[PDB]
């Protein structure tokens, strides 16, 4: 309000309209929640007390809401919009350059109460970043992880990690167009999804989504495929990467697309309905890039572009229509192209996993129809999908009372017995042989007992090696 009613400054008639809209916005019920005073009809009344001379204040209801560093961005970006509007008129203003210096001092200095908040603000306002700055941010994340496992106080240092990731999500689009880290920040995003926490997972996708968006505008996927780009830059530090893949139960050398999809499938289990739609977008953007490399109309089915179509099967209508089951354009599960035993063992584990945890009538219907047709078209490899289907099918047979959902299940039972009476060619442990022994485990729900899985001792070493190779000094 003081800005709109100040005479020292001469704001043009355009700017004064910007401020007046901001004045009304901040009084909306949306911003009462951001500031943390929801359930308060008016702020003025609570701020002041009438009997302020007679008696002292009497605080109560010590129950105190929490704060989320995502809220701080929304406020921190509303203010930054106001300030820039002013600087257009005020010549040679120094407001933004003074504010940045204040943030940059607390951002890189150890203070467990102010550092997390000073990183979310340093990135939201800064206009230039250098390589020397990025290393400090990436080395605050390395020290944050080590503290978590050593001590028993996690939540204290699990907000200094989410703040380091949020900073990087904003500072990447300002880096130099020819820096290696434009591509090496795809493994930080991947290495963060493996920590199994809703907040860390939520921030990890936000870095990944814009990592693809930025690389597109630089035209780096023009003549190469995702597997080529990210797997080429991982080579110098392959020794450290390999060890992580062993324990997480996924492999990236054997099959890239499926390993990448494995992490993204957990997004469907996130409590917030806003992170579910973000992991769907990351799948489309990856699908349109692999197909463009092969010039295959964006909906063709091949070995490379089959993994991202099973994930979109139950959420994207165009995929279901353009890829229809033969036993009602082209039909998924074609045995002409999917003629590799491995490439067809995984595609069944993806489908079994999506139904083991799903709870929805419309979803279970579509996924079971694609499993019945799989029983006949792929008789030999189907026995590697029993334990995943063992428990839930047994329950459905006993108590299900839906003809639409009970039909496909019966077709599966008949197929199993028909092709039985032969020595199992592929055992249940066929997947552990070539790496993917943890694929079904990694897609479970987020654990209520939030704790670092304790194989984070390797993520520290990987990050440390990443700095040494690409930021020598």
């Amino acid at each position: 309000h003081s800005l709109c009613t100040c005479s020292q400054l001469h704001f043009s008639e355009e700017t004064k309209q910007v401020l007046r809209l901001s004045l009304t916005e901040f009084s909306l019920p949306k911003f009462y929640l951001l500031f943390g005073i929801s359930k308060v009809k008016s702020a003025a009344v609570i701020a002041f007390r009438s009997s302020y001379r007679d008696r002292s204040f009497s605080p109560g209801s010590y129950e105190r809401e929490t704060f989320a560093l995502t809220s701080l961005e929304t406020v921190t970006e509303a203010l930054l919009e106001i300030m820039e509007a002013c600087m257009r008129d005020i010549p040679t203003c120094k407001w933004l350059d003074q504010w940045t210096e204040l943030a940059q001092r607390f951002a890189f200095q150890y203070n467990p109460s102010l550092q997390p908040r000073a990183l979310v603000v340093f990135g939201c306002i800064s206009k230039r970043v250098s390589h020397g700055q990025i290393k400090q941010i990436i080395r605050i994340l390395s020290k944050a992880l080590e503290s978590c496992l050593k001590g028993p106080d996690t939540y204290n240092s699990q907000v200094l990690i989410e703040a380091t990731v949020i900073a990087l999500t904003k500072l990447q689009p300002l880096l130099n167009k020819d820096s290696p880290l434009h591509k090496a920040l795809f493994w930080v995003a991947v290495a963060v999804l493996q920590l199994d926490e809703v907040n860390l997972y939520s921030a990890g996708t936000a870095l990944l989504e814009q990592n693809l968006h930025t690389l597109d505008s630089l035209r780096i996927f023009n003549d190469k495929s995702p597997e080529e780009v990210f797997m080429a830059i991982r080579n110098p530090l392959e020794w450290h990467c390999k060890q992580m893949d062993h324990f997480v139960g996924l492999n990236f050398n054997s099959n890239f697309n499926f390993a990448l999809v494995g992490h993204l499938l957990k997004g469907y289990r996130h409590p917030s309905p806003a992170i579910v739609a973000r992991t769907v977008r990351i799948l489309h953007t990856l699908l349109t890039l692999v197909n463009k490399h092969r010039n295959c109309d964006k909906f063709e089915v091949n070995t490379q572009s089959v993994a991202y179509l099973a994930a979109l099967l139950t959420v994207s209508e165009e995929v279901r229509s353009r890829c229809s089951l033969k036993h009602r354009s082209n039909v998924l599960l074609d045995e002409e192209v999917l003629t590799d035993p491995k490439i067809q063992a995984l595609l069944l584990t993806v489908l079994a996993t999506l139904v083991k945890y799903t709870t929805d009538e419309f979803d279970q219907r579509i996924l079971y129809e694609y499993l019945a047709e799989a029983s006949v078209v792929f008789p030999k490899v189907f026995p590697v999908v029993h334990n995943l289907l063992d428990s839930k099918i047994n329950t459905l047979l006993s108590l299900c009372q839906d003809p639409n959902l009970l039909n496909p299940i019966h077709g599966i039972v008949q197929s199993v017995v028909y092709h039985e009476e032969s020595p199992p060619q592929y055992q249940t442990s066929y997947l552990q042989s070539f790496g993917f022994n943890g694929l079904w485990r990694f897609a479970g729900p987020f654990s209520k007992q939030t704790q670092i899985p304790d194989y984070a001792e390797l993520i520290v070493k990987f990050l440390d090696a990443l700095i040494d190779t690409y930021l020598p000094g």
Binding site: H386, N394, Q401, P403, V413, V417
Partner: protein, 139 residues
């Protein structure tokens, strides 16, 4: 390993829909329980020995059951009717495998229970008439 245990579920649910057994309103207008029959008939083609053996025990238990009341008798009459009708379809449905190595089941499990109905069975003037016609087709 697992699929053998899957068949048991189809068979086990069959008993829980017999009128004499507590209905529990699981019929769902009989569409849900009728689908179970079609699967059970189909499964017999490849697991004939297992399905047939399970059916005999289900029939044997019903025979060795004592119940009183007009409703009780009516339920048991309709109960045994379903088992026999299903059992006959499996035999007729089964292709001409001509496997003559079912002696074990026939001698003890199956024949004694079918033979019982062929007796005069004067319990019901109208019920026994239908049972013989259905039982005779099985034999």
């Amino acid at each position: 390993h697992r699929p053998v245990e899957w068949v048991q579920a189809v068979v086990s649910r069959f008993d829980e829909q017999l009128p004499i057994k507590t209905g529990q309103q699981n019929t769902h207008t009989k569409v849900s329980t009728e689908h179970n029959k079609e699967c059970l008939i189909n499964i017999s083609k490849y697991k004939f020995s297992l399905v047939i053996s399970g059916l005999t025990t289900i029939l044997k238990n019903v025979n060795n059951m004592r119940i009183f009341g007009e409703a009780a008798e009516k339920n048991l009459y309709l109960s045994q009717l379903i088992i026999l009708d299903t059992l006959e379809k499996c035999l007729a449905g089964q292709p001409k495998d001509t496997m003559r190595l079912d002696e074990t089941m026939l001698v003890k499990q199956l024949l004694p229970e079918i033979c019982h109905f062929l007796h005069t069975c004067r319990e019901g003037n109208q019920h026994a008439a239908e049972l013989r016609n259905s039982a005779s087709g099985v034999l």
